[PDB]
Each structure stands twice: as structure tokens, then as C-alpha cells.
Design a protein around this ligand. Structure first.
Ligand code: M51
Ligand code: M51
Ligand SMILES: *[C@@H]1O[C@H](CO)[C@@H](O[C@@H]2O[C@H](CO)[C@@H](O)[C@H](O)[C@H]2NC(C)=O)[C@H](O)[C@H]1NC(C)=O
Ligand SMILES: *[C@@H]1O[C@H](CO)[C@@H](O[C@@H]2O[C@H](CO)[C@@H](O)[C@H](O)[C@H]2NC(C)=O)[C@H](O)[C@H]1NC(C)=O
Ligand SMILES: *[C@@H]1O[C@H](CO)[C@@H](O[C@@H]2O[C@H](CO)[C@@H](O)[C@H](O)[C@H]2NC(C)=O)[C@H](O)[C@H]1NC(C)=O
Ligand SMILES: *[C@@H]1O[C@H](CO)[C@@H](O[C@@H]2O[C@H](CO)[C@@H](O)[C@H](O)[C@H]2NC(C)=O)[C@H](O)[C@H]1NC(C)=O
Ligand SMILES: *[C@@H]1O[C@H](CO)[C@@H](O[C@@H]2O[C@H](CO)[C@@H](O)[C@H](O)[C@H]2NC(C)=O)[C@H](O)[C@H]1NC(C)=O
Ligand code: NAG
Ligand code: NAG
Ligand code: NAG
Ligand code: NAG
Ligand code: NAG
Ligand code: NAG
Ligand code: NAG
Lengths: 729, 729
């Protein structure tokens, strides 16, 4: 063979690029799509377009525009710029509104600078924005704001936005406001961080800064004091008629009030009915309230007959958070994903005043998500097809006859596409299918009335052509058996793979609870280069604790992080050698984040299986990590709860066993999530026992080490180390 | 040759220890010596001893005593324990006092815990001590203490102790207390750091600390707000237990009060005469005031007729600060090292009320220090012997005839001993010589009356014969010519050095202003292992800006740090590489601190001479370093002064050029001196141009990376690096 391989320059410089089809549905019939930096509107039924916004229109705006969003009624567009990333989801920016009718910018009563979030009402053109930790509402883009809260206080009181931990762990989103479905009410959460301890780290900034600055974030580590939360609803329709419109509190149930708790879900049901879920600090008990506006009293009431209680015997509640409800039009019933009697996650259907739900799906497989609900159908993604827990397909269940279930995606192109996501139009008339593997991604448009394919949106044939002429790795997804249970693994295999030759193996690890590293997604990444150019088999493996294959497996690491998930990676490696195509002298392991911890635990296990390993931004001790995530899996680090296992599960306690391996440790200094602290303590421990290792810090990089230069630097650095570890003299 | 080499373990585990003989003169006739934990008193004339303190006297004391300090009159002993390091000289400790007459510990009115500094008066047994930034005085060990200052305040107001920058740079000590020669008066300085910005960094502590802490130190960076200082004198003979102490302030001369300035020297002349020097923040103007106590007034008066002005046109004043005066018995005249007209540092004789001084020494060589003064002789150390700048000998000059100069150490043992330091008895009747090279250290005792050599104190006999069984490297000290100027170098040469063989070379750099790395001192260090086990030549070179050779060379880097001193190392290496025994393909460079800065600048120079190098705790940008040190050499970083060269002289600007070399960058996270920031900015810059390098941070280590485990770990890592850099294909 004489075609070039997939090299590291190829990966780092993005020579081979995936084409996407990111559309935004503006109605049941139309979607927006960015083409040549023009923004086009598409008729779904026929596939014709017009230009919605010409690429010339903001030439003389004077600012690089970061993003855009159109009022639901089409009359205005919101423009975002001066974007500066905050955490994983949060950022600040400047904003302006362009009147789409008048074809004019709006210059009075403008959204202030340094605004933290902004949302259109779901209908019409109301705006809700958060500035200086307070909520404000405009009825019309050009009119003065109404202030909603007066309590905003930097790092202390958050109205309508999350604090660090609620952003990262609880909502995995920044905003904490929820418009009612026709824009009348605005629901919002308020977070109090007064007694939450601060993480403190240096930020060095450009070299022109003489003194480093101290970044200080309220961040509760395990067992520490948590933010408290309150919930409010204001009637925005009365702001123009009243001076200071009252924010009506809905208090948490008495069974949450008895101690530390969380607000873990907000979902509107109807115009006058909202639902909330709370979760005790011990994350095995949740309560859903369903609350109705009492018109004559102006107050919200949650009838105890409508409360629903979820609880767990074998582990925590939900995959990561208690699962969200989906309401039928009338708000009298709802669908929720919950773990059945066998431990598998399936769709359960509730009436709002009955506690017992009815299961509409079942089997040894799981529903991944509920994607849309019409009067006749519920659409959902699952891994049912062919018993492949790492597969994804779109299903449709007939509401009047549960035995009538159609796979809408399975057989469309079943050699090329086993992993789907979906985007439904506003009332589910159309759906876009997004196939992400095991062949090249494919984007298709479908009409829901007949379930027929309307046209191919993006098929990536341009790329396929280029890839024909490159020695690509292949991928093997399969299982092995242990104690009579299936555990999946995938392998990125060098081109011309030969079962008779002996290959070096790199074990790629994440292995956190409900993770999945063995799937059917097509990826171009570092592993691609390693299999293609360096002839390394890159393996991953879903051992105990992993997701989408049921509770028996997922909860097996309940309260016991740093055990089975760790042993099973080692076991995985023993089984690859046993396959006879793996050089037992050249087994490596590497992981980022949770994977950094597992890699490190495996390297300090004293197993003899691995020659070397790389840990990037690892957890090193569970007490250093955040309360919400750590406590969900570990409980509390108190003598009466689970301290023994917190202390027994640190990387540092294994320092002496790192004498047997070559170790590369890497961490960004401004990592606000897994604090440099945690690698500072691994390195100190290794020094203390006289172990030599390799280290790299990334100045002002966070958990993602995602900046362009640093991204390339870290994969270059790691490549040398892998090659060095494997080099044969 | 079947003998072992001096290995890396040998260096790190101190297999071969230099024996010393540290004594403390107590009179003109006797000294103390710590022998097998016992304290012995020696009579100098005869060499006989008695036991002063038996080691077992405190067997059941409670804690391990860190240090002892006997009152000058021999009645009491101060016991130091609970020693906790602060900066380079500062610490806190606890203290108890033992009465040698009553043979019992004092239990009444003990010195408080966390005492910052304590000192006996130079006669008798008074005590002055600092606690919570205030000065206290005990006339008797058991008597209640009088409080002298009430202004003391953490990180803000310092009485009788220094702030960070005065400790490190100005006094190079922590005390700011000066007893008068018979203990009547106590002179002290007060520092005010109110507007001095804080350096902040993380400290991680032991594993069990859940949240890292932020250390905050008042530290002025180049051009920032400096501390302000005041000077006071209190009569301790007139204290009341009923009235607050009265401190008489001596204000600085008007020509210092016009702007930012420093207090740089305090030296008592008599019982009632004290001298101070003040230095302008632009450190090329200093003035000495001489102030007499006015028995009528109770005030101290500094007659302008007694003011002494010192200035430099080519650089700064004094080697690092203006030199100390050595007064005669009556205090009417004094001796002081100042730069002569040829820019060589020589002894000048001053009358207290006359502007001009008289140089009593002269020549193209320099006086290192004045060590002792009698009515007949001044004893000094100089580098005159054989015009060797890196050698050190003891001389006496006859005060009535300056032509009568006698060398007291030159001829004692020329082959073994070319580097001396001395220690005189109280009245200069006896002196100790410490020879420390080029052969093994040798300690001897002498009498001044006829310069008889009484006896050998310690000759390092054991070690000598130990070393005979090891393949010890040799040291070569020589010079090269650059523009008709002699510049010196040293090479640590491997055993059995073979000039027809080609050796790899490591350039060991410091190169700071007034530095000296080519000398005759005998050292057992990293370079020793390198030459002996690894057969690497380790060279050091003293180029422009190096000290002890006149201001023509020392001042060449004035306002121009990171130029000639960097250029000169490259040229040295260049020249070394053209010698026949140097492998021009294997030349490395390393430095710590200022040498880390030079190493990095050299590596970024684009010279092509060096294949690899190591920088430990380097300065990277002069604006990050402290004011006193940096401004002395660079002036102010304003466009009206020397900003451009502050910006021309960064490691960061040279990042591109690292592309062609292998670089290891190492720094401790708790470095209060050269802040981690300096390396964080280096790392970021290399990341930004795409240059691979190696790195190592040391959690909670400071500038010395000196804790036993970190020490062994750093040298282990560096050894691995150098060996890898020097391996052939
Ligand atoms: C399919 C999916 C994945 C996740 N998450 C997002 C949060 N994520 C954690 C956020 N912080 C954690 C983290 O960063 N570490 C944990 C231990 S090592 C570092 C992961 C796990 C996956 N969510 C989710 C979780 C909570 C609310 C909504 C969605 N849903
Ligand atoms: C023979 C000698 C050496 C020094 N010094 C001590 C202080 N030292 C500086 C203290 N901080 C500096 C430092 O640590 N860096 C400077 C450049 S990189 C880091 C060195 C230089 C030599 N002194 C001295 C200086 C001032 C007062 C009294 C004595 N005398
Ligand atoms: C709108 O109403 C709120 C609540 O009634 C007012 O906020 C209160 O103001 C008082 C005194 O200023 C504080 O002591 C209370 O704690 C505040 N309560 C809350 C919930 O913030 C607010 O001032 C009103 N706004 C206007 C413009 O009148
Ligand atoms: C956020 O929480 C703190 C308590 O954790 C509240 O602060 C207290 O407020 C009362 C007045 O109602 C004071 O008397 C207390 O002394 C305060 N305690 C502390 C610890 O500061 C604060 O009001 C809360 N903020 C809200 C709800 O906006
Ligand atoms: C959105 O839903 C709200 C909530 O029901 C509607 O507000 C009510 O409108 C009816 C008119 O039929 C009145 O009887 C009630 O007094 C209103 N209640 C409140 C609290 O405002 C609102 O009309 C709907 N808005 C739109 C645009 O359809
Ligand atoms: C230490 O210095 C600060 C100034 O740096 C002094 O504070 C000033 O005090 C004067 C008189 O009391 C006031 O007029 C100023 O407003 C203060 N300035 C600032 C910036 O605080 C402080 O008093 C000094 N302390 C001592 C003991 O000398
Ligand atoms: C140390 O020297 C001081 C300063 O001269 C002595 O104090 C003076 O002593 C004389 C007698 O010799 C008295 O007439 C003065 O009134 C004293 N002056 C002051 C300012 O106190 C002191 O006696 C000496 N101290 C010791 C312990 O010998
Ligand atoms: C703007 O619009 C047209 C697409 O029809 C094209 O000429 C141009 O490439 C577009 N893109 C720009 C100006 O970035
Ligand atoms: C697409 O074509 C139809 C005609 O069949 C027309 O009515 C519709 O408005 C067109 N839509 C767009 C977005 O161009
Ligand atoms: C929730 O967890 C705690 C401790 O793990 C346990 O004692 C409690 O009974 C649990 N609740 C349920 C319903 O199992
Ligand atoms: C040394 O010897 C002399 C006797 O000649 C004696 O007086 C003196 O006290 C002795 N000194 C010591 C320190 O033991
Ligand atoms: C220092 O602390 C110890 C133990 O806490 C205490 O017993 C002792 O009295 C203290 N020392 C002084 C001088 O107060
Ligand atoms: C001495 O002065 C200080 C501060 O000025 C004051 O706090 C203290 O009360 C005074 N004490 C006496 C006894 O005068
Ligand atoms: C001190 O240095 C400055 C700045 O280079 C210079 O202008 C001046 O001549 C010097 N001061 C004296 C008193 O020589």
C-alpha cells in the first residue's frame, strides 16, 4: 500500500473535516440553516429556500457576531457578540436587537453590557435577561425593562442563573428561568451561596499583567456547605399595570425541607400548571410537585394527591439526574423514563393524581430519550436494535395500542448507520435524522405524516472521496463474557490489521458511572492517528458502572468508586493479550477527567499489565471534587457514612506502585472543575516516595485544555511519550 | 581503575561529608564549640577545654531544641524550639530561657509562642524580641517585659523586623533591631507596607486539606508601591512599668525625603554615636548620617557637617548595597570599601567631619571585606594574591604606614589553600582561618601578636583518605581573552581526563550581577557526580557583569540585564567547543534562579551552540521580579526611563527560537521569591508558538526546592534529562 496514513498533523490541523447539517426549526414547516454565512429559510416539504438574512447585513456592524436567535414570532433577531466563555455552559456577551420588519437596529432601551443570559419568550417577542444577578423583563425590545429581583449579589445570590455547581452538575445548563408555554408566567430559581466555601486559583493572563490574579468561585467540595435554593413565579402580563409585581414562591415539600436538598427539574405542563422535582442531598429520594395557579388568590398550589415520589434501593436516582417528564397536551398525564423492576430504563406513563405508572416499553435494553409526543404517537431513542447497547435508533409507539412499535431508523442503511439522534419540527410534522456511525455521518429529512424520506441533506461524499485515498483504521465493536454477563469493547485497528502479528495496545479510558466508550459512532481523533500512522490498537471497554445496559451493571460501583470500574479495565487488558494479537510488553493506558483518575488508579494498582500511562486532568481524591457529583455516587465523607471508602480510594495512597510504570501527568492551571490541586497532590505524593515521572502544566487552560494552541501542544506532547514508551530497540 | 566513581546517590545521600569547625568567640581569649551535642569552651592560647553545657541537661525538656544562644555574660541560655521556616532568613520559633547559676528553667514571664525574633544585648543579658510585629524588652530573663511599640499589624506595620523585600534584598536578614555597644540603647526600624500590592499563590498543604489556601505577601514588583520606613532609638536604661516607652525618631535627610528611598545600613559607632545610610530608590545616590545623643535634649542630632555622600556614575552603589563602615574605638574616623577612580573596590579612610577619604589600598584587584580593626592594623580579605579574582586571602595593613601590607594566609599552604575566610576574637587577639579550597577544607587557629599558627583545628583527614578510594574529578581554573580582557572560567574535569578524547560539556550558569562562578572553592555537588560517573565536563564562566574585577566589567550590564552576560556565556561555550576535547555536538546549559533566566535567554538566542538545557525557577520578565533588586540594575520600567529594555529582555519574546533545542523547565508552586508566574508565562509562550519541551512543577516547594524528597527528585529528573540529551545513536 502506498497511500498516506492519517497523521497527527491531519488530526491537529483538521485536514479531514466532518460536514454537519445544523438546522434550527422555526415552525412546523420551516427551518433555518447557515450557508456561506447567509442565513437561509427552508421549506421542509419541498426543500426550497430563500435568504432570511443576507451575509452582507452586518458588515458595517463593527463587531464580530458570535451567534443569533430569532424571536419565535419572526419579528426580531437577537445578536450576540463580545462573547467570553465562563464555565462549561455559561458565558457573558453583548447584545442588540434587529427589528426584522423595519430592517433597523434598536438603539434605545438596549440590553445592558455584561449581560449573563437572555431568553426569548416561547411565543411572541418578550425577553427575559439576567444582569448583575437580577432578572429583568422587556415586553417590547424597544421599551424599558422591568426589574424582577433586587437581591442579586456577586458570587452570593443568583436569580434566574445557576451558580457553579448547579450549572455543572444539576442542570448542566446556565439559565435558571422557565417561561410558561405562552409567555404569561416567568418561573425562576434563586441560589444562595453565602456559606459555600471558595476554590481559589491563580490566573496569570497575558504577560503584560504584573500581578497574577486570584480567581475565586463558590464551589462546594464533598461534604461541604451547599447552596440553598428558592423557587418563584411572576406573572409577566401584569408588569405594565402594576408597580412592583409580586414573585410568588412555591416552597419545597416538608420531606425536602427536613434537610439539604436540590431543585432538580422544572417543566411547565400547561399555561396554569407547573411541575417541580426536588432531590435530597442524599440523592436516592426525589419528589415531584405539580402546581396549579389559583386565580382568585394569585397563588400556586401543589396538591399532595399529585406529588410523585421516586426512590432507589440499588443506587442513585436517574442516570445522572431524576428523569424529566413529558406532558400530554391537557397536562393531566405525563411520560417519564424510569428504571423498571428488572433494573432497565423504560417509558412509564402517569396520570397526575395516581402514583402508580404503567410501563409502555420493556425488554433487556433501555430507552435513551423521549424525543416528541403528539396526540397519537410518542417518539423515543433506544438501544433495542440487535441487542447493541452502544447502538441508537428512533422508535415510534402508537398511543392507543402499545404493541404497535415501529423502528423509524433501524433499516434505513443498517451497515452504515446504527447511531441516530433526531430533531423534530415544532409540532413534529417533520424530523431530521442525524446518523453518526459506524460509517460517515448522514443527515436526512423525513415527514411524520407518512414516515417517508424526503431527501438527503448531507451525506459526506466529499470527505468519503478524500478518505478512499487514505489508509484508514477500521473499528471493531464486540463483547466478551465475564461471570456470565456481556461487557462491550471497541477497538480502533491499524489498516491491514493482521491477527498473526503482535500489536502494541493503548487502552483509552473514561469509565465513570453511566459512561459508554464502546459504541458505533464514527470518530476522527487522536486514536485515528495512533492506529493509522503508529500501528497501535486503541481499545476502550465498558466494565461495571457503565450505562445503558441496566442497573445491575450501572449501580455495581454504587458507593464504591475506584474499584470495579478500575479492576475491569485491568481485566479488559488481560483479555486483549489472551486474544493473541497484542504485544504483552507494550500495553499503555490513558484517560482524561474521570479517565485520568481510572488510568492513575490502574497505573498505581501494581498489576504489572501496563508499561506506561497518561492522566489528563484527573480526579485524585474524591473529597477534592464537587458535592453534587461525588455525593451522588459516594454519599458523605463522615465516619457514620462512607469516609472509609473516600480515604481508601485516592490516587496518592498508591504512590509506591508507580515505580513499576512510566507516567505522564498533565493538568491545566485554571481548571475550575477538577482543580490543579488534585494533580498537585499526586505529584507531591510521587516525589515523597522518590518516584520519577513526567509532568506538564498548561498555564491558564481549564478542564478542556481546549484552546487551539494548547490543544495541539498536548496531543503533540502525548504522542512523543506514547511513541517513546513503545519504541522498539 | 577499579575504584568506584562519585555517584548520584553519593551526592544525594551525602556519603562524603566535609567536616567543619564552627566556633563562636565569647571573649578575646575563649570560644564555644558544639561537640557531640555538648557545648565546650576553648581557651585559644592552649587549646584546652571545659564543658560549658552537657548535652543531657535538657534530656527531659519536652521538645527537640533547634538552636542555643548563650547570653554574652554566660549566665543564661536561650532555647529555640518549634522552629517554623518563613522566607530565606525569617522564621517563628518558641523560646525558653535557662538560668546557668540557679540551674533551672525560667517559668515566670516566658517569651511568648510564635516569636518572630529575639536577641541578647551585646553585653550582659537584656532581651529584645518581636511578637505580633511589636518590640518588647526584658531587662532580666524572669522580669516582665516592657512593650516598646504598639503599632504592629500583620502584613502592614513591621517594628524591629523586616517586610519581605527588606529581608530578601536590603538587609539580607530578618532583624531590624540594633543594640548599642553596651546595651543602653536599642535602635530599630519600622516598615509600613500599607499600599504595597500582594503577591498571591496557592498552597496545597497535606493531602487532608480539602481546599487549598491562598498565601498573600506584600511584595513590590518592579515599579510598584514600595514599603516606607522610619527609624527610632529608645533608651532601655530608662523604662517604666507604669509609663509607655518613648522612642526618639531620627528622620532621614531632606535629600531622601524628596521621594522614594531606602534605609540600607545601621552601624553603631560608640555608646552615644550611631550611623545610618539611606539609599534613593534610584540606587546611585546614598547618604550616611552620623548622629550623636544629646544628653541635654534627650534627642539624637545628625550634624550636616558629618553627612557622607556616596554616588556612582556608571552603575549602582556598592556590590549589592553601600558597604558598611568600620569605626575606630573613639568613633571619630572609619574605614569603608568604596570604588576608587579606576573602579576597583578599595579601603577608604574617613574622618567623620571631612568630605574626602583617603584610600589605603590600591591596584587592579579588590578588597572583599574588612574583617578586623585595631589601633595598629586593619585586617581584610582580598583577591590580590597572584592576580586571581577567584582566590581569597587574609591581609593586614599597618595603619601608620600604608606601604606595610602583610599577607597572613597566602603562603601557609599554596597548593591546598587559595580561598580563605577568617573569624577574629573579640579584640582581634586571635583569629580562625577557614581554608575551603582548592584542596580539602582546613581550619587553623592563629594569634595576632606575631601571626603564629597555634594549631590545626580540623584538616579533614578522614575524608581525604576516603576520597582516595573514589575516582574524583579534577578542577581546572583558567581564563580566556575577549577584547584584550581576561575573563575566567572553571571546568570540572572527569577522572583520567584525556585531552585527545572528545567530551560532552554542561555549562553551569549563574551570571547575575557581581556573581562569581569561577573560583578556587572545593565543592561536592551535582557537577561532581556528572564529571565522575558520567564523564561530562561542567564548565562555568564569569563574563561581563561578574564581580570582584572592577566596575568596568561589573557595570557593563547596567540598565542592560539579559544582554552581555547572556552573550558572554554563548561566546564562552563557542570557544570551549573549538577546543579539541569538547564534543561540539553535545553542549548543554543549566542554571537556577538568575542562572535559570540566563540559561533560558541563551537557549532562546538562536545561537545554535546548545543542544539542550535546564532552567530551574528562572526569572522570565523583569517586571515580575522585586523592586529593590530589579531597579538597582534596570531602573524604572516607565517609558521615561527604561521600559523598552524591560520589554526587550524577556524569555517570552524568544519562544520561536526554542524550536531547535530540548528544554526542561522546573519551578516550585510555593516560590515566594521568583514566583511560579515566571515559568507559567514561559510555558504559555512556548505553547503559543508550537514548541515542545519538558516540564516539572514541585507542589509547595519554594525557591530552594530544598526539602529532602524534592531535592533528590529534582536532581534525579535533571540527571535523566542530561543523560538522554547526551546519548549517541
Ligand atoms: C447524557 C447526559 C450526560 C450528562 N452529564 C453532564 C454532567 N456530567 C458531569 C459534570 N461534571 C462531572 C465531571 O466533570 N467530573 C466527574 C468526575 S471527574 C470530572 C461530569 C456527567 C454527564 N447529563 C446530564 C447531567 C445532569 C443534568 C443534565 C444532563 N446527561
Ligand atoms: C556577598 C553578598 C551577596 C548578597 N546578596 C544577598 C541577596 N541576593 C539577592 C536576594 N534576592 C535575589 C534573588 O533571589 N534573585 C535575583 C535574580 S533571580 C532571584 C538575589 C543577592 C546577593 N549580599 C548582600 C546583599 C544585600 C545586603 C546584604 C548582603 N552580599
Ligand atoms: C419590589 O418588591 C421587593 C419585595 O417586596 C422589594 O425588595 C425588598 O426591599 C426591602 C427594602 O428595600 C428589603 O429589606 C427586602 O428584603 C426586599 N425583599 C426582596 C425579596 O428583595 C423591592 O424593593 C421592590 N422594588 C421596588 C422598586 O419597589
Ligand atoms: C442567604 O443566606 C443567608 C443565611 O445563610 C441570609 O443571611 C442572613 O439574613 C438574616 C436576615 O434575614 C440575618 O439576620 C443573618 O445574620 C444572615 N446570616 C448570614 C450568615 O449572613 C441571607 O438573607 C440569604 N439571602 C437571601 C435569602 O436573599
Ligand atoms: C396564556 O395563558 C394565560 C394563563 O391562562 C392566559 O391568561 C388568562 O386569560 C384568560 C382569558 O381567557 C383570563 O380569563 C385570565 O384572567 C388570564 N389569567 C391570567 C393569570 O392572566 C392568557 O390569556 C394566555 N395568553 C395568550 C396570549 O394566549
Ligand atoms: C502607614 O502608611 C499609610 C499611608 O500609606 C498611613 O495611612 C494614612 O494615614 C494618614 C494619617 O493618619 C491619612 O491622612 C491617610 O488618609 C492614610 N492613607 C492611607 C492610604 O491609608 C498609615 O497611617 C501609616 N501607618 C503608620 C503607623 O505609620
Ligand atoms: C553605656 O553607655 C551609656 C552611654 O554613655 C552610659 O550611660 C551614661 O552613663 C554616664 C556615666 O558613665 C552617665 O553620666 C549618663 O547620665 C548616662 N547616659 C545615659 C544617656 O544613660 C551607660 O552607663 C553605659 N551602660 C553600661 C551598662 O555600662
Ligand atoms: C455571500 O453570499 C454569496 C452566496 O450566494 C457569495 O457570493 C459569498 O461567498 C457569500 N459569503 C461571504 C461574503 O462570506
Ligand atoms: C417554496 O415553494 C412553494 C411553492 O410550491 C412556496 O409557496 C413557498 O413559499 C416556498 N418557500 C420558500 C421558503 O422559498
Ligand atoms: C438512601 O441511602 C441511605 C444510605 O445509603 C440508606 O440508609 C437509605 O435507607 C436509602 N433509601 C432507600 C429508599 O433505600
Ligand atoms: C586552660 O588552662 C589554664 C591553665 O593553664 C586554665 O586556667 C584555664 O581555665 C583552662 N581553660 C579552659 C577553657 O578549660
Ligand atoms: C505555648 O503553647 C503551649 C501549648 O499550647 C502552652 O502550654 C505554653 O504555655 C505556651 N507558651 C507560652 C510562653 O505562653
Ligand atoms: C500606651 O499607648 C497605647 C497606644 O497609643 C495605648 O493603647 C495604651 O493604652 C497606652 N498605655 C498606657 C499605660 O499609657
Ligand atoms: C542615576 O541614574 C539616572 C538614570 O540613568 C541618571 O540620570 C543619573 O545621572 C544617576 N544619578 C546620579 C546622582 O548620578
Amino acid at each position: 500500500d502506498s497511500r498516506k496514513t492519517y497523521t497527527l498533523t491531519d488530526y491537529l490541523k483538521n485536514t479531514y473535516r466532518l460536514k454537519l447539517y445544523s438546522l434550527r426549526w422555526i415552525s412546523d414547516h420551516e427551518y433555518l440553516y447557515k450557508q456561506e454565512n447567509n442565513i437561509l429559510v427552508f421549506n421542509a416539504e419541498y426543500g426550497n429556500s430563500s435568504v432570511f438574512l443576507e451575509n452582507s447585513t452586518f458588515d458595517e456592524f463593527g463587531h464580530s457576531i458570535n451567534d443569533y436567535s430569532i424571536s419565535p414570532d419572526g419579528q426580531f433577531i437577537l445578536l450576540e457578540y463580545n462573547y467570553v466563555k465562563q464555565w462549561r455552559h455559561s458565558y457573558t456577551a453583548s447584545y442588540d436587537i434587529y427589528d426584522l420588519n423595519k430592517r433597523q437596529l434598536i438603539t434605545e432601551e438596549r440590553i445592558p453590557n455584561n449581560t449573563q443570559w437572555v431568553t426569548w419568550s416561547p411565543v411572541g417577542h418578550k425577553l427575559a435577561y439576567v444582569w448583575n444577578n437580577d432578572i429583568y423583563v422587556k415586553i417590547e425590545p424597544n421599551l424599558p425593562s422591568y426589574r424582577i429581583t433586587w437581591t442579586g449579589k456577586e458570587d452570593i445570590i443568583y436569580n434566574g442563573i445557576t451558580d457553579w455547581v448547579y450549572e455543572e452538575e444539576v442542570f448542566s445548563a446556565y439559565s435558571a428561568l422557565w417561561w410558561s408555554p405562552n409567555g404569561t408566567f416567568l418561573a425562576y430559581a434563586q441560589f444562595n451561596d453565602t456559606e459555600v466555601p471558595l476554590i481559589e486559583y491563580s490566573f496569570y493572563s497575558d504577560e503584560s499583567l504584573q500581578y497574577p490574579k486570584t480567581v475565586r468561585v463558590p464551589y462546594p467540595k464533598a461534604g461541604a456547605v451547599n447552596p440553598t435554593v428558592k423557587f418563584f413565579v411572576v406573572n409577566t402580563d401584569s408588569l405594565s399595570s402594576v408597580t412592583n409585581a409580586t414573585s410568588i414562591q412555591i416552597t419545597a415539600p416538608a420531606s425536602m425541607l427536613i434537610g439539604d436538598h436540590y431543585l432538580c427539574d422544572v417543566t411547565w405542563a400547561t399555561q396554569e400548571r407547573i411541575s417541580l422535582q426536588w432531590l435530597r442531598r442524599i440523592q436516592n429520594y426525589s419528589v415531584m410537585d405539580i402546581c396549579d395557579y389559583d386565580e382568585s388568590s394569585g397563588r400556586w398550589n401543589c396538591l399532595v394527591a399529585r406529588q410523585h415520589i421516586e426512590m432507589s434501593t440499588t443506587g442513585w436516582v436517574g442516570r445522572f439526574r431524576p428523569s424529566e417528564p413529558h406532558f400530554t397536551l391537557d397536562g393531566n398525564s405525563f411520560y417519564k423514563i424510569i428504571s423498571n423492576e428488572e433494573g432497565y430504563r423504560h417509558i412509564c406513563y402517569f396520570q397526575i393524581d395516581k402514583k402508580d405508572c404503567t410501563f409502555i416499553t420493556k425488554g433487556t435494553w433501555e430507552v435513551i430519550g423521549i424525543e416528541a409526543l403528539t396526540s397519537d404517537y410518542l417518539y423515543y431513542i433506544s438501544n433495542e436494535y440487535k441487542g447493541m447497547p452502544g447502538g441508537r435508533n428512533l422508535y415510534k409507539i402508537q398511543l392507543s395500542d402499545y404493541t404497535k412499535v415501529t423502528c423509524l431508523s433501524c433499516e434505513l442503511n443498517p451497515e452504515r448507520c446504527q447511531y441516530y439522534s433526531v430533531s423534530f419540527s415544532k409540532e413534529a410534522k417533520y424530523y431530521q435524522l442525524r446518523c453518526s456511525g459506524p460509517g460517515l455521518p448522514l443527515y436526512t429529512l423525513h415527514s411524520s405524516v407518512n414516515d417517508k424520506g424526503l431527501r438527503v441533506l448531507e451525506d459526506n461524499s466529499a470527505l468519503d472521496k478524500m478518505l478512499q485515498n487514505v489508509q484508514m483504521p477500521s473499528k471493531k465493536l464486540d463483547f466478551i463474557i465475564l461471570n456470565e454477563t456481556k461487557f462491550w469493547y471497541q477497538m480502533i485497528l491499524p489498516p491491514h490489521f493482521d491477527k498473526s502479528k503482535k500489536y502494541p495496545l493503548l487502552l483509552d479510558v473514561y469509565a465513570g458511572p453511566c459512561s459508554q466508550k464502546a459504541d458505533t459512532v464514527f470518530r476522527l481523533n487522536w486514536a485515528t492517528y495512533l492506529a493509522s500512522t503508529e500501528n497501535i490498537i486503541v481499545a476502550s471497554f465498558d466494565g461495571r458502572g457503565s450505562g445503558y445496559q441496566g442497573d445491575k451493571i450501572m449501580h455495581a460501583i454504587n458507593r464504591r468508586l475506584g474499584t470495579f470500574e478500575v479492576e475491569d479495565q485491568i481485566e479488559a487488558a488481560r483479555q486483549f493479550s489472551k486474544m493473541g494479537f497484542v504485544d504483552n510488553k507494550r500495553i499503555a493506558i490513558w484517560g482524561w477527567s474521570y479517565g485520568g483518575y481510572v488510568t492513575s488508579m490502574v497505573l498505581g494498582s501494581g498489576s504489572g499489565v501496563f508499561k506506561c500511562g497518561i492522566a489528563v486532568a484527573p480526579v485524585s481524591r474524591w473529597e477534592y471534587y464537587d458535592s453534587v457529583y461525588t455525593e451522588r455516587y459516594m454519599g458523605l465523607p463522615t465516619p457514620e457514612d462512607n469516609l472509609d471508602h473516600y480515604r481508601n480510594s485516592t490516587v496518592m495512597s498508591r504512590a509506591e506502585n508507580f515505580k513499576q510504570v512510566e507516567y505522564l501527568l498533565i493538568h491545566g492551571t485554571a481548571d475550575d472543575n477538577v482543580h490543579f490541586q488534585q494533580s498537585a497532590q499526586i505529584s507531591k505524593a510521587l516525589v515523597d516516595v522518590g518516584v520519577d515521572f513526567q509532568a506538564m502544566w498548561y498555564t491558564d487552560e481549564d478542564h478542556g485544555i481546549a484552546s487551539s494552541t494548547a490543544h495541539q501542544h498536548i496531543y503533540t506532547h502525548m504522542s512523543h511519550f506514547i511513541k517513546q514508551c513503545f519504541s522498539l530497540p
